Design an enzyme around this catalytic site. Structure first.
Site, PDB file in Angstrom:
ATOM      1  N   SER A 160      21.332  43.972  35.905  1.00 51.36           N
ATOM      2  CA  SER A 160      21.104  43.828  37.359  1.00 51.36           C
ATOM      3  C   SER A 160      19.684  43.242  37.667  1.00 51.36           C
ATOM      4  CB  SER A 160      21.358  45.192  38.010  1.00 51.36           C
ATOM      5  OG  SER A 160      21.560  45.108  39.403  1.00 51.36           O
ATOM      6  N   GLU A 172      32.254  45.424  39.739  1.00 52.86           N
ATOM      7  CA  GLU A 172      30.855  45.342  40.166  1.00 52.86           C
ATOM      8  C   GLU A 172      30.558  45.872  41.590  1.00 52.86           C
ATOM      9  OE1 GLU A 172      28.256  44.839  38.560  1.00 52.86           O
ATOM     10  OE2 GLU A 172      28.681  43.657  36.746  1.00 52.86           O
ATOM     11  N   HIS A 205      29.513  48.994  38.561  1.00 47.55           N
ATOM     12  CA  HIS A 205      28.218  48.394  38.265  1.00 47.55           C
ATOM     13  C   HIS A 205      27.372  49.456  37.573  1.00 47.55           C
ATOM     14  CE1 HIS A 205      24.599  45.937  39.076  1.00 47.55           C
ATOM     15  NE2 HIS A 205      24.001  47.044  39.487  1.00 47.55           N
TER      16      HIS A 205
END
Ligand SMILES: *[C@@H]1O[C@H](CO[C@H]2O[C@@H](C)[C@@H](O)[C@@H](O)[C@@H]2O)[C@@H](O[C@@H]2O[C@H](CO)[C@@H](O)[C@H](O)[C@H]2NC(C)=O)[C@H](O)[C@H]1NC(C)=O
Ligand SMILES: *[C@@H]1O[C@H](CO[C@H]2O[C@@H](C)[C@@H](O)[C@@H](O)[C@@H]2O)[C@@H](O[C@@H]2O[C@H](CO)[C@@H](O)[C@H](O)[C@H]2NC(C)=O)[C@H](O)[C@H]1NC(C)=O
Ligand SMILES: *[C@@H]1O[C@H](CO[C@H]2O[C@@H](C)[C@@H](O)[C@@H](O)[C@@H]2O)[C@@H](O)[C@H](O)[C@H]1NC(C)=O
Ligand SMILES: *[C@@H]1O[C@H](CO)[C@@H](O)[C@H](O)[C@H]1NC(C)=O
Ligand SMILES: *[C@@H]1O[C@H](CO)[C@@H](O)[C@H](O)[C@H]1NC(C)=O
Ligand SMILES: *[C@@H]1O[C@H](CO)[C@@H](O)[C@H](O)[C@H]1NC(C)=O
Ligand SMILES: [Cl-]
Ligand SMILES: [Cl-]
Ligand code: NA
EC number: 3.1.1.8
Length: 527
Positions: free
Chosen positions: A196, A323, A436
């Site tokens: 990320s 995600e 995620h």
């Protein structure tokens, strides 16, 4: 007893029993002058140097940052909150090495995510002792300033140039360049890895001339600098610096005056006003992020990428299957972790208002049109599924795929994965799927630890991932060569092959989210 002598002085580690073996850990090694007082908002400075032994036997201070208080008591969120004191004096790093000391080990360096607003190297999911034990690599990780203390920008003005957190990361990589031989590491075999905002940082180091030669290869987990959240335009970055001055009664006329003032505010006052420097926030807001500073970043990165101005090396890039789900419970109407969140068309559209602040009305019809063509049944979970896909495709999957295409066109090998295993221990509900951030524990090898309550199929999955990551770093090729595994093919423009990572069958497929990214990547940026 284990003392290593470094360019700046001696440091004592700590032995750890891991899987009937031993790893040495040096937790909390300083890598820059603490950025306090007159140094707040400035590029990190060199380390003075010390006699006597620095004890590196516990994690250090996490950098100052706002906390996720959305679900107190809840492990799903709270697992990402700092687990050491916050302090502006947070510029430290960690080194785990295998025992017996290795001779010339490949080095893995982790850069955490957290929106550039949050995060720390001491999370239990970034603990590098499994890697060092199992793969005999050295693992390094660092704390870097986040939020305004890390990315506050007033362009060209060295009081607050922007990108300070990225210089923190960069100075930690120097430290590894200068120092890791003494720990048994090969400065010539360094792979950066990150997830990320951490992945986005990895990709910016691929564009920074100053980083070109502080590493070998790169791994990008769910992020890349071309994601819509990853770079703040110079316009926004000053609007924000001013709204923050304003908000803290620090508005001036001389801009070096604004910064002198902000240096007197105490960290809580800065943090407290960060969320308001923007009029419309989304659950995915990055109020203070990387900028084109003319220093770390010499031009808009979309241009560098397109025109091939970046380090020529191999990359491993990938994404998780759901995600976008994580973010829906931080503000989308009718969404909750405590129920199945079946939402209606009208909520879907309000959802889009939350995620796409503005964004014309036609912008948002176009998303709805592309994503709500039901095929079909009806299917109460249609709009719930669609909003997560919108959020994940736009923010993570398509920017990752687009980055990989473009990078691959200048001739380097590139490998792409699609992570689709939901952890048996996941504390968030079922509808949120393969969230995620929830591949990290597979990469760090937590399921190798049998005492921990993961399934058998999970241990095996993680064992194979760790092998593929380690082979990538040492050799530039993420194959697992021994157990008749599926060969991971390079990602080429044209065929666009990728490897799926799951507990049953891993497969080779082609053209992930082809229709969706054509929408995101070709059409949407126009609106
Ligand atoms: C660039 O900044 C201005 C500044 O406005 C902000 O003042 C800050 C102190 C902060 O508290 C913030 O919440 C506030 O919005 C933005 O102008 C604002 O725009 C909206 C409508 O779009 C108005 O209703 C606000 O009240 C207005 N404020 C002022 C004083 O003009 C501006 O939108 C922003 N530009 C962006 C979006 O990047
Ligand atoms: C799933 O829950 C959401 C989220 O909000 C609710 O959390 C629930 C578990 C419940 O205990 C309640 O106290 C809490 O508000 C529900 O959305 C809510 O729906 C109510 C219906 O009156 C609205 O008034 C709320 O504004 C709305 N919450 C917000 C602020 O988004 C949702 O209806 C529920 N859906 C199910 C069970 O499918
Ligand atoms: C340690 O090995 C050094 C080189 O190995 C690396 O070669 C790089 C080009 C890169 O591809 C890495 O992945 C390789 O592992 C060598 O030149 C050093 O002299 C060695 N030093 C020792 C053994 O202490
Ligand atoms: C570092 O810790 C060790 C613990 O054994 C101790 O011997 C040494 O005095 C320490 N120095 C300190 C506390 O600064
Ligand atoms: C603004 O004040 C700073 C800090 O003393 C000073 O260096 C600078 O010259 C001033 N700029 C002008 C001339 O407006
Ligand atoms: C190879 O598979 C065996 C099981 O037959 C297992 O014990 C071993 O850890 C595997 N190696 C890797 C690197 O996956
Ligand atoms: Cl309608
Ligand atoms: Cl397989
Ligand atoms: Na269109």
């Amino acid at each position: 007893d284990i003392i290593i002598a470094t360019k700046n002085g001696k440091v004592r580690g700590m032995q750890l029993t891991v899987f009937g073996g031993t790893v040495t850990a040096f937790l909390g090694i300083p890598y820059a002058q603490p950025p306090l007082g007159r140094l707040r908002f400035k590029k990190p400075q060199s380390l003075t140097k010390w006699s006597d032994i620095w004890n590196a036997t516990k994690y250090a201070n996490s950098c100052c940052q706002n906390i996720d208080q959305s679900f107190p008591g809840f492990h799903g969120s709270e697992m990402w909150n700092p687990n050491t004191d916050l302090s502006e004096d947070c510029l430290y790093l960690n080194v785990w090495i295998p025992a017996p000391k290795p001779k010339n080990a490949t080095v893995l360096i982790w850069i955490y995510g957290g929106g550039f607003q949050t995060g720390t190297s001491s999370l239990h999911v970034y603990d590098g002792k499994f890697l060092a034990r199992v793969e005999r690599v050295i693992v390094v990780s660092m704390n870097y300033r986040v939020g305004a203390l890390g990315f506050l920008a007033l362009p060209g003005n060295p009081e607050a140039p922007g990108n300070m957190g990225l210089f923190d990361q960069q100075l930690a990589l120097q430290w590894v360049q200068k120092n890791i031989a003494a720990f048994g590491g090969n400065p010539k075999s360094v792979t950066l890895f990150g997830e990320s905002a951490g992945a986005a940082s990895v990709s910016l180091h691929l564009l920074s001339p100053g980083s070109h030669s502080l590493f070998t290869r790169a791994i990008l987990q769910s992020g890349s600098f071309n994601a819509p959240w990853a770079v703040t335009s110079l316009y926004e970055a000053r609007n924000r610096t001013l709204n923050l001055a304003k908000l803290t009664g620090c508005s001036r006329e001389n801009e070096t005056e604004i910064i002198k003032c902000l240096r007197n505010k105490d960290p809580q006052e800065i943090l407290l006003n960060e969320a308001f420097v923007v009029p419309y926030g989304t659950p995915l807001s990055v109020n203070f992020g990387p900028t084109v500073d003319g220093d770390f970043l010499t031009d808009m990165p979309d241009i560098l990428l397109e025109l091939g101005q970046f380090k020529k090396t191999q990359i491993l890039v990938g994404v998780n299957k759901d995600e976008g789900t994580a973010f829906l419970v931080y503000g989308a109407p009718g969404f909750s972790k405590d129920n199945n969140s079946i939402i209606t068309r009208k909520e879907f559209q309000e959802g889009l208002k939350i995620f796409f602040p503005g964004v014309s009305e036609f912008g948002k019809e176009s998303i709805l049109f592309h994503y709500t063509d039901w095929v079909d049944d009806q299917r109460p979970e249609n709009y719930r599924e669609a909003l997560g896909d919108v959020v994940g495709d736009y923010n993570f999957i398509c920017p990752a795929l687009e980055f990989t295409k473009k990078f691959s066109e200048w001739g380097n090998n590139a490998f792409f994965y699609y992570f689709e295993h939901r952890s048996s221990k996941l504390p968030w509900p079922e509808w949120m799927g393969v969230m995620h951030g929830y591949e990290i524990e597979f990469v760090f090898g937590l399921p190798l630890e049998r005492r921990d309550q993961y399934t058998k199929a999970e241990e095996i999955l993680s064992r194979s991932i760790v092998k593929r990551w380690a082979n990538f770093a040492k050799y530039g090729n993420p194959q697992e060569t021994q157990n008749q595994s599926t060969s991971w093919p390079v990602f080429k423009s044209t065929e666009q092959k990728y490897l799926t990572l799951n507990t049953e069958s891993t497969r080779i497929m082609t053209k992930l989210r082809a229709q969706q990214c054509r929408f995101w990547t070709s059409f949407f940026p126009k609106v």
